[PDB]
Design a protein around this ligand. Structure first.
Ligand SMILES: CC[C@H]1OC(=O)/C=C/[C@H](C)[C@@H](O[C@@H]2O[C@H](C)C[C@H](N(C)C)[C@H]2O)[C@@H](C)C[C@@H](C)C(=O)/C=C/C=C/[C@@H]1CO[C@@H]1O[C@H](C)[C@@H](O)[C@@H](OC)[C@H]1OC
Ligand code: HEM
Length: 393
């Protein structure tokens, strides 16, 4: 009676047909995930937005509940596990430091890094793996620039970070050692910056004040590592998926080569269209009974709000399955909605823009150097994207 979930096949970016059916016949329905409790699934744009934006739907129970999910282990904590007012306080301090202006200031360093990565690929000759050499490299290096990790330390910081990716095949202790190295280093960097501040985010986070409040020592550290993990795999996977789409849809590539000024709009349309998640936004828990589409979600029940399906809802987006780089309006939920809206979105936007700009300017003939049907797709079961993208140019 509840349907087995996820519906998405991980071996591709296709939106499961089941979503559209439910948007039409059963917009609030029951699902059984591979791990964790049965939950409600909400699929219409208006309802998904309503859930992520409604005060009666909270994240705190995540910490004491068996969350609907695709993997046996549970990754808990961070800002996304918090509710106002505690969430509000931490978020006000972070954004006071992590401004859209800071994000934009990073575009020139993001481009320089992107050029380096493309040099390194040209150096080893076609076919190069776009995933290993570029997509897994650009976002963690940009996070290094953002935080203020000295250039000398970018390689070891990148090495430790790759062990946090859901696609890493390392043992538990290997991952554990990489995490303790990342924590110790970050705590030390924070301590330097406190007693000798520079222009980087760690310095600004240390000095951030809000009506006499400040971030504690532990807060600073947990927030810095939280930015890394929230900002690495997401961006890496979306770069891979966007270039995969550029390489397999000639009209998309051609539109952006003829008119690179369309890249920012194409980044929005692709963020809308790509159902990047295997499943949904982090479960929200009802704090009281809430009636939605005339179904009563009872207090305490978990609710999985699919931004993947919402972004492809025909009721909100004309001809929703079409990728249209000029689409307007495009009020997609690809960076979420409500108090947990992606804190890093201006910088993600910068990176994704830069990735496409540099790749298209350096390698305008970039294309797959194996057939599409032979691509290997990640089975990490959190996000969808290719494990390797061998490319020729
Ligand atoms: C795909 C996106 C997420 O990836 C993840 O959720 C990463 C999960 C990986 C797969 C985990 O590693 C696995 O642990 C198992 C116990 C063993 C397994 N192997 C060895 C067989 C191993 O692969 C976790 C436990 C790895 C550790 C280092 C970790 O805590 C990772 C955190 C990364 C979270 C990533 C980012 O999501 C962010 O999660 C936070 C909990 C939220 O607060 C928020 O960030 C502030 C969120 O992004 C919106
Ligand atoms: C293309 C890349 C990215 C995508 C598609 C993405 C998407 C998201 C989405 C959908 C959420 C809301 C999740 C939910 O409500 O369950 C979120 C939250 C968050 N993101 Fe991102 N994100 C990206 C990149 C980044 C970057 C680069 C950073 C930081 C540098 C970042 C930091 C965060 C943090 C800290 C949160 C939790 C915010 C909160 O709970 O208050 N993200 N992101």
């Amino acid at each position: 009676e509840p349907r087995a979930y996820p519906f998405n096949d991980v071996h591709g970016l296709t939106l499961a047909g089941r979503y559209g059916e439910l948007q039409e016949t059963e917009p609030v329905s029951r699902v059984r995930p591979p791990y964790g409790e049965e939950a409600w699934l909400v699929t219409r744009y208006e309802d998904v937005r309503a859930v992520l934006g409604d005060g009666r739907f909270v994240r705190g129970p995540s910490m004491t509940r068996d969350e609907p999910r695709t993997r046996p282990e549970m990754v808990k904590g961070g800002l996304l596990s918090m509710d106002p007012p505690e969430h509000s306080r931490l978020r006000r301090l972070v954004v006071k430091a992590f401004t859209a202006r800071r994000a934009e200031s990073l575009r020139p360093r993001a481009r320089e890094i992107a050029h380096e990565l493309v040099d390194q690929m040209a150096a080893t000759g076609q076919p190069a793996d776009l995933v290993a050499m570029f997509a897994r490299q650009l976002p963690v290096r940009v996070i290094c620039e953002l935080l203020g990790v000295p250039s000398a330390d970018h390689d070891r910081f990148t090495r430790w970070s790759g062990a946090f990716l859901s696609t890493a095949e390392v043992t538990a202790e290997e991952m554990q050692e990489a995490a303790e190295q990342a924590y110790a280093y970050m705590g030390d960097l924070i301590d330097r910056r406190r007693k000798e501040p520079t222009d980087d985010l760690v310095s600004a986070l240390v000095q951030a004040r809000d009506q006499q409040d400040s971030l504690s020592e532990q807060e600073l550290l947990d927030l810095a590592i939280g930015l890394l993990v929230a900002g690495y795999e997401s961006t890496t996977t979306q770069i891979a998926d966007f270039v995969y789409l550029l390489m397999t849809r000639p009209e998309l590539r051609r539109q952006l080569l003829d008119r690179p000024e369309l890249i920012p709009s194409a980044v929005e349309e692709l963020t809308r269209w790509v159902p990047l998640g295997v499943g949904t936004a982090a479960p929200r828990y009802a704090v009281e009974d809430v009636t939605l589409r005339g179904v009563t979600i009872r207090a305490g029940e978990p609710v999985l709000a699919s931004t993947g399906a919402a972004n492809r809802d025909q009721a909100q987006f004309p001809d929703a399955d079409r990728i249209d780089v000029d689409r307007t309006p495009n009020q997609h939920l690809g960076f979420g909605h409500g108090v947990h809206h992606c804190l890093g979105a201006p910088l993600a936007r910068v990176e994704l823009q830069v990735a496409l700009e540099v790749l298209l300017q350096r390698l305008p003939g970039i294309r797959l150097g194996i057939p599409e049907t032979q691509l290997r797709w990640s089975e990490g079961m959190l996000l969808r994207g290719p494990l390797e993208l061998p490319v020729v140019w």
